[PDB]
Amino acid sequence: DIAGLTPCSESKAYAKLEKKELKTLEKRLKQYEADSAPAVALKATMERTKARFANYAKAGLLCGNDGLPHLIADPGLALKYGHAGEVFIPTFGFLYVAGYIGYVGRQYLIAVKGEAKPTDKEIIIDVPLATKLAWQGAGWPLAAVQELQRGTLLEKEENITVSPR
Amino acid sequence: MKDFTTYLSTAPVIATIWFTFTAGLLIEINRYFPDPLVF
Amino acid sequence: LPSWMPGADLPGYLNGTLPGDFGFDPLYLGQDPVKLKWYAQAELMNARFAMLAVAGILVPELLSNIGPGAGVAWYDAGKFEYFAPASSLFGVQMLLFAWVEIRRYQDFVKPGSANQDPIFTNNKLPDGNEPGYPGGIFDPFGWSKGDIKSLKLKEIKNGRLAMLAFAGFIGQAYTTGTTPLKNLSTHLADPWSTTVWQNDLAR
Amino acid sequence: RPLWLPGSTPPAHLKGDLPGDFGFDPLGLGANAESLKWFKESELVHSRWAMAAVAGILVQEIVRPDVFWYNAGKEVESPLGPLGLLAVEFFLMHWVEVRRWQDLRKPGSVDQDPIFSQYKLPPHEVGYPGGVFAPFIPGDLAELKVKEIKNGRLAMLAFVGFVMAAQVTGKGPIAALQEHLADPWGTTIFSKAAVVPGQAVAPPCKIPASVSYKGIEIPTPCFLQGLWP
Amino acid sequence: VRPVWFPGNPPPAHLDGSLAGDYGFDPLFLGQEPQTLKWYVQAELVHGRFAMLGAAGIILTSIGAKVGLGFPEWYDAGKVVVEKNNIDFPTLMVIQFYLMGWAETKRWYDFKNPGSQADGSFLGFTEEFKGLENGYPGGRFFDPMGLSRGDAAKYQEYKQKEVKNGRLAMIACLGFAAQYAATGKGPLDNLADHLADPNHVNFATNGVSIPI
Amino acid sequence: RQSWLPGSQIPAHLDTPAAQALAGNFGFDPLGLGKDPVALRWYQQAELIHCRTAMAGVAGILIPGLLTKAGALNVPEWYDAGKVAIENSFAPWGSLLAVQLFLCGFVEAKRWQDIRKPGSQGEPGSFLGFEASLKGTSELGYPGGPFDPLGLSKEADKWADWKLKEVKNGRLAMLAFLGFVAQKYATGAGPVDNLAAHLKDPWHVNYATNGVSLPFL
Numbered sequence A: 001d002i003a004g005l006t007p008c009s010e011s012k013a014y015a016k017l018e019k020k021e022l023k024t025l026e027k028r029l030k031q032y033e034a035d036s037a038p039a040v041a042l043k044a045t046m047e048r049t050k051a052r053f054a055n056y057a058k059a060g061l062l063c064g065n066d067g068l069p070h071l072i073a074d075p076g077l078a079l080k081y082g083h084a085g086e087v088f089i090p091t092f093g094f095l096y097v098a099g100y101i102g103y104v105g106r107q108y109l110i111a112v113k114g115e116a117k118p119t120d121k122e123i124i125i126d127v128p129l130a131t132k133l134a135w136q137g138a139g140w141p142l143a144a145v146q147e148l149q150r151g152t153l154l155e156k157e158e159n160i161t162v163s164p165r
Numbered sequence B: 001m002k003d004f005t006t007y008l009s010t011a012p013v014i015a016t017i018w019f020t021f022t023a024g025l026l027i028e029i030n031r032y033f034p035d036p037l038v039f
Numbered sequence C: 001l002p003s004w005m006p007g008a009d010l011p012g013y014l015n016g017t018l019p020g021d022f023g024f025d026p027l028y029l030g031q032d033p034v035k036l037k038w039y040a041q042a043e044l045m046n047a048r049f050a051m052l053a054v055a056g057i058l059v060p061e062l063l064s065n066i067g068p069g070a071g072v073a074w075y076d077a078g079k080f081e082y083f084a085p086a087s088s089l090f091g092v093q094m095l096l097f098a099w100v101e102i103r104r105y106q107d108f109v110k111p112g113s114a115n116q117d118p119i120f121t122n123n124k125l126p127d128g129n130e131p132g133y134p135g136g137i138f139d140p141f142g143w144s145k146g147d148i149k150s151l152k153l154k155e156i157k158n159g160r161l162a163m164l165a166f167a168g169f170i171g172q173a174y175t176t177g178t179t180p181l182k183n184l185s186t187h188l189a190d191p192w193s194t195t196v197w198q199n200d201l202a203r
Numbered sequence D: 001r002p003l004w005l006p007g008s009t010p011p012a013h014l015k016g017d018l019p020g021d022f023g024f025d026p027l028g029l030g031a032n033a034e035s036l037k038w039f040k041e042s043e044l045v046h047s048r049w050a051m052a053a054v055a056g057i058l059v060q061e062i063v064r065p066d067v068f069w070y071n072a073g074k075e076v077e078s079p080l081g082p083l084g085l086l087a088v089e090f091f092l093m094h095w096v097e098v099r100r101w102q103d104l105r106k107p108g109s110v111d112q113d114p115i116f117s118q119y120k121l122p123p124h125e126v127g128y129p130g131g132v133f134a135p136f137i138p139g140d141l142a143e144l145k146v147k148e149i150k151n152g153r154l155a156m157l158a159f160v161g162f163v164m165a166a167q168v169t170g171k172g173p174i175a176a177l178q179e180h181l182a183d184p185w186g187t188t189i190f191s192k193a194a195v196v197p198g199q200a201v202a203p204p205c206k207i208p209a210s211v212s213y214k215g216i217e218i219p220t221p222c223f224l225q226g227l228w229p
Numbered sequence E: 001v002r003p004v005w006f007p008g009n010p011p012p013a014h015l016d017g018s019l020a021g022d023y024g025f026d027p028l029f030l031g032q033e034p035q036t037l038k039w040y041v042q043a044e045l046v047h048g049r050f051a052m053l054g055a056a057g058i059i060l061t062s063i064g065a066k067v068g069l070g071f072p073e074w075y076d077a078g079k080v081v082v083e084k085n086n087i088d089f090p091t092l093m094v095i096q097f098y099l100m101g102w103a104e105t106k107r108w109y110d111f112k113n114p115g116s117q118a119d120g121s122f123l124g125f126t127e128e129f130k131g132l133e134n135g136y137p138g139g140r141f142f143d144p145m146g147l148s149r150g151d152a153a154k155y156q157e158y159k160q161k162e163v164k165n166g167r168l169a170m171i172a173c174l175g176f177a178a179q180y181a182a183t184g185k186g187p188l189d190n191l192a193d194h195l196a197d198p199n200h201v202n203f204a205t206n207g208v209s210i211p212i
Numbered sequence F: 001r002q003s004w005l006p007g008s009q010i011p012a013h014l015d016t017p018a019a020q021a022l023a024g025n026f027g028f029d030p031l032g033l034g035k036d037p038v039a040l041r042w043y044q045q046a047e048l049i050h051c052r053t054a055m056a057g058v059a060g061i062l063i064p065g066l067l068t069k070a071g072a073l074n075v076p077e078w079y080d081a082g083k084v085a086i087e088n089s090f091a092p093w094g095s096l097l098a099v100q101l102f103l104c105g106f107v108e109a110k111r112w113q114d115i116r117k118p119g120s121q122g123e124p125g126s127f128l129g130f131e132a133s134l135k136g137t138s139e140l141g142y143p144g145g146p147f148d149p150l151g152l153s154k155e156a157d158k159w160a161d162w163k164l165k166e167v168k169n170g171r172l173a174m175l176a177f178l179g180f181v182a183q184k185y186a187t188g189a190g191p192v193d194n195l196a197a198h199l200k201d202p203w204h205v206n207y208a209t210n211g212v213s214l215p216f217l
C-alpha cells in the first residue's frame, strides 16, 4: 500500500508475532492448575492479546517486514487512504487539551494579578476561582481567536529587555 | 477547619490530588479500553 | 356573564365584544389583541367550513339509508369518477379560492376596502363593513334585521359544535373503521355495551 | 363543654365553634384555618358516605340474604354493562363533585341552577347546603349537626369494622354478630390471633385470591394483611 | 444547660442550640463555617429522610416476607421486580435520573438562591416552591396538611422528632446493611433468631464481627 | 425575566440593553463566549445562519420522510438521498459541489461584507439594480427588500414575536439535525422509523437499550 507496506491483516509476520506471543503465554500457562488464579490471570492475558491483535487488524493499520504497525504522518495521504485516526485526529485532540491547560493557566494568572497578593494566590491556590476557570475553559479556541483579533492576546513592547535589545 | 482548607489549597497538596485524579483517570481509561493506539 | 365554569375567575381581556364570549382561555392564548383579532377571524372561518363539512357528511349519508348518483361514504369520495381526475379539480379549486381568499384577506387587512365589484363597478357592498361579517350580497334574503348579537352567538355556537363534530368524524372513523350514522345506529341499538371504553377495551 | 378526656385541656385552636368539637386533636392537624375548612368538609363527606354505606350493608343483608356485600359487585347481574354503569357514574359524579368543590373553593358561587334560572339556593355555610337539599328539618340545626357528626363518626368506625370483620371472618355484619352472640368468650379478635415474642399467629384471610370477573381478573388483596393482630 | 452528647464537655462555639438535634456533636469540627454548616444541615435532613423511607420499606417488606405473603427480601427485591415484571433495568434507572435530577436540581438552586424557585418559571407555581427554612420546604405541596404554620412550638417539637427519627433510621439502615453482610439472612429473620436465643445468637456468635 | 435556569445568576454580558433586545435571550452563556460584544455580534449572526439552514435542512428531512410513509412521494432515506439523486442526476457530484461553492461563495461574501460594514452593499454603481435593495433593515442579520417579499416584517407590534418564534424553531431544528445524525449512527434506521419504534414500545426501545449511547449499563 503506502511506502510498500502491506496491511497488517494481510501481513504474515503479524500473524507469526501473534502466534509467537500466544506460544510464550501458553508455555507459561501449562505449568499450573485450571481454576487457580495464575491460570485465570494468564487466560485473561491471552484474551487481551487476541483482542489487541484483532483490533489492530480491524483498524486497517499498515505493517512492515517485521509485522509491526506503522503510522502515517501526512494529512493528505492519511485522509486519502483512511489513516486520519492515527496522527491527524490525535494531533487535533492533543491541541485541544493542551490549549485547554494553557488557557486555564493564563486566565488564572490574569485573575490573580489583579489583587494585593498575586504571589500568595500563586502559592495557595484559590480553588473556587480555579475550578470556575477550569469549567469555563471549554470555549478556549473561540476565546483565543477572539482575544487574538482584539489585540489583547499580546503584550506590547513594555516588556523587559536587555541593554543590547 | 478554615486553616485546614487553606493547607489543602496549598500548592503541593493540590498537585498531589490533581495528579492522583489525572493518573487515576488515565488508569481507568486504560483498564476499560485496553491497549489503544489509534482513533 | 355566562361562564364556561361558573364562579371561576375569567380572563380580563374577554369582554363580550366577541360572539360567544364565555371567558374560556386557560392557556391565555388571547392576551395580545392582534392575536385575538386573528383568532376571532380564524374561529369564524374554521367554524363555517366545519358547519358546511358536517352538513355535507350528514345529508348524503342521511339520504343513503332512506329512499343519488352514489351512496358512497364521506371518506371514500376520492375513489369516484366525477367526470375528471381530482388533480384538475384541485387546480380549479386553488385558482378560485386564491381569488376569494386573497379578497377576504385584503378586507381583513384594510377594512372598508374590498366592497365594490371589480368588473361591474356599480355593484357594491354597503358601508357596514365588520371584517368577518360582510353583508350585502352575502346576506341576500334580508336577514341580520335582528341585532345579530343573538344571531352571531348562534352562529359561533353551531360552529363550535360542528368543529367538535368534525373532529369527531375523523376520530370515530379512524377508530371504528366505519361511518358515523352507523356508529350512531349502534349506540342507539345498544348504548350500554357500545361505548368508547367498550370499543377501546375490545381492541 | 364535654371532652374526649374529661379533665384534660383542649388544644388552643379548638374552642367549641364547630359542631362535634370535643377538643380531640393530638397531632394538631387543624392549627391552620385554611386546612381546617378543607378537613371539616372532608369529615362531613366521609361521614355521609359511611352512614349511607352502613345503611346499605345492613338493609342489603336484611332484605337479600345469601348475597355477601363484599362480593355484591362480583355476583350482581344486569343487562346494563359494567363500563356503561361506570361511565354513567363517572360523568354524573364528576359533575356533582366539581359543583361541590367549586362551592368549597369559592364560597357560595354555584347556588343558582344552570338550566332553570328561577331557582336559586339560599345563602348558607360550607358543608351544609340547605334549600332543596334540606326540605324537612326536625328541630334545630344546632343539635342536628351534632347528631349528624356523631352518627357519622360512629358509622365510619362501623364501616372499617365491617371491612375488617369481612376480611377476617368471611361473613356479614349481622352474621358476625350472631357468631359473637353464639360464642362471646371464644369469638373475639383476641380469641383468633396473638403475637408473643416467641411466635406470632394471624387469622387466615377469608377472601381467597384475584377475583375472576368477566375477563378483567380483578386482584383482591386484604388490607395490611401482614400486620393483623 | 442543654444535654450534650458527651456529658462534662462544653459544646463547640458553632453549635448553639438553635438547630434541631443540636447536641454539640462535632469533634472533627466539620461545620465551623456557617455556610458549610447550613449545607450539612440540609444534607443531614436529606440523608435522614431517605433513611426513614428506606427503613420503613425494609421493615414492611420483611414483615410481609416472614409472614407468608411471598414478598422477597430486600437484597433480592430489585432483581425479582425487574425480572418478574416487563421492566428493563437501564431505562428505569435513566427515568429515575430524570425525575430525581429535576427535583434535586430545584433543591440545589434553592439552596444557592434562597427564594428563587418561586418566580413562576416552573409551570405557573409561585410561593409553593418557596422554602420556609433551610431544608424545610413547607408550602402546599410539601406540607399539604399544614403543620409548620400553626403552633410554632409544636412545629419545633416536630423538627426535633424528625431529626431524632432520621438519625435513628440512618443507623438502622447501616444496621440492615451490616446485618446482611454478616449473617446473609433477612433482618427480621435475624430478629427472630435473637428472640429465639438471646444469650447465644448475636454478633459475638456470628463469627465475623469479632474474629477472635 | 425568563432564564434557562431559575436561580442561577445571569452573566453580566447577557444583561445589557444590547443583549436583552436581541432575540431568545435566556441568559445561557456558561462558557462565557459572548463577553466580547464584537464576538456576541458575530455569534448572533452565526446562530441566525445555523438556525435558518437547520430549519430548511430538517424540513427537507421530515416532510419527505413523513410523506413517504403515506402514499405519495417515494423518497429515499436522508442518508441515501445523495446517492439516489446522483444516480438520477446528470452531473458528477464534484462538478455540482464546485458550482454550489461558487454560487454560495458569492452570496456568502455579500453577507460577510454586510457583517463587516452594515451600510456596505448599497454602493451606488456597484450593482446593476440590486444595489438599492441590498442594504440592511437597521438590524443586522434581518435584511429587507427581495428577502421577505410578503411584508410580514412591516408591522412593529408583531416583530419581536416573529424574531422569537424564529430563534426557538431554529434552535429546535438544530437539536433535530444533531438527533438525525446521532440516531442514524446508533440505530441504523430513519428518524420516522425511530419515532414509530418509540411509539410502538416506549419502555423498551430507547437510547438506554440501543447498546451504544451508554455502554456501561
Ligand code: CLA
Pocket: A074, A075, A076, A077, A080
Ligand atoms: C510538513 C511538511 C509536509 C511535507 C513534506 C508533505 C509531503 C507531502 N504531501 Mg502533505 N500536507 C501537509 C504537510 C506536508 N506534506 C500539511 C500541513 C497539509 C494540510 C495543509 C498537507 C495536505 C496535503 C494534501 C491534500 C496532499 C498532500 C500530499 C503530500 C505528498 C506529495 C506533495 C508534495 O510533494 O509537496 C510537498 C509538501 C509541501 C511543500 C508542504 C505543504 C503541503 C501543501 C499545503 C499541500 C500539498 C498538496 C499537493 C499540492 C498535492 C499534490 C498532488 C499529488 C498527487 C501530485 C507529499 C508526501 C498529496 C498526496 O497525497 O500525495 C500522494 C496530497 O494530495 N499534503
Ligand code: CLA
Pocket: D004, D014, D018, D019, D020, D021, D022, D023, D024, D025, D028, D029, D030, D031, D036, D039, D040, D041, D042, D043, D046, D047, D153, D154, D156, D157, D160
Ligand atoms: C375521615 C376522615 C376524618 C377527617 C378529615 C376528620 C377531621 C376532623 N376531625 Mg374527626 N373523626 C373521624 C374522622 C375524620 N375526622 C372519625 C372516624 C372519628 C371517630 C373516631 C373522629 C372523631 C373526632 C373527634 C372526637 C373530634 C374530631 C375532630 C376533627 C376536626 C379537627 C381535627 C383535625 O384537625 O384533624 C384532621 C383529621 C384528619 C386529617 C384525618 C386523619 C388522617 C390521618 C393521616 C389518618 C390516620 C387515621 C388512622 C389510620 C386511624 C384510622 C381509624 C382506625 C380505627 C382504623 C377535623 C375537621 C375534632 C372536632 O370536630 O373539632 C372541630 C374533634 O373534637 N374527630
Ligand SMILES: CC1=C[C@H](O)CC(C)(C)[C@H]1/C=C/C(C)=C/C=C/C(C)=C/C=C/C=C(C)/C=C/C=C(C)/C=C/C1=C(C)C[C@H](O)CC1(C)C
Pocket: E025, E026, E027, E028, E029, E030, E031, E047, E048, E050, E051, E053, E054, E055, E057, E058, E073, E074, E075, E077, E078, E170, E171, E173, E174
Ligand atoms: C456527625 C459527625 C460529625 C463529626 O464532625 C464527624 C463524624 C463523627 C464523622 C460525623 C458522624 C457521621 C456519621 C455517624 C455518619 C453516618 C451516616 C449514615 C450511617 C448514613 C446512612 C444513611 C442511609 C441512607 C440514606 C439509606 C437509605 C436507604 C434506602 C433508600 C433503602 C432503599 C432500599 C429499600 C427500601 C428496599 C429495596 O429492596 C432495596 C433498597 C434500594 C436498598
Ligand SMILES: CC1=C[C@H](O)CC(C)(C)[C@H]1/C=C/C(C)=C/C=C/C(C)=C/C=C/C=C(C)/C=C/C=C(C)/C=C/C1=C(C)C[C@H](O)CC1(C)C
Pocket: F028, F029, F030, F031, F032, F033, F050, F051, F053, F054, F056, F057, F058, F060, F061, F077, F078, F079, F080, F081, F082, F174, F175, F177, F178
Ligand atoms: C450556546 C452555547 C453557549 C455556551 O456558552 C456554551 C455552549 C453550551 C457550548 C453553547 C452551546 C452550543 C450548542 C449546543 C451548539 C449546537 C449546535 C447545533 C446542534 C448545530 C446544528 C446545526 C445543524 C445544521 C446547520 C444542519 C443543517 C442540515 C442540513 C442543511 C441538511 C441537509 C440535507 C438534507 C436536507 C437532506 C439530504 O438528503 C442530506 C443533507 C445534505 C444532509
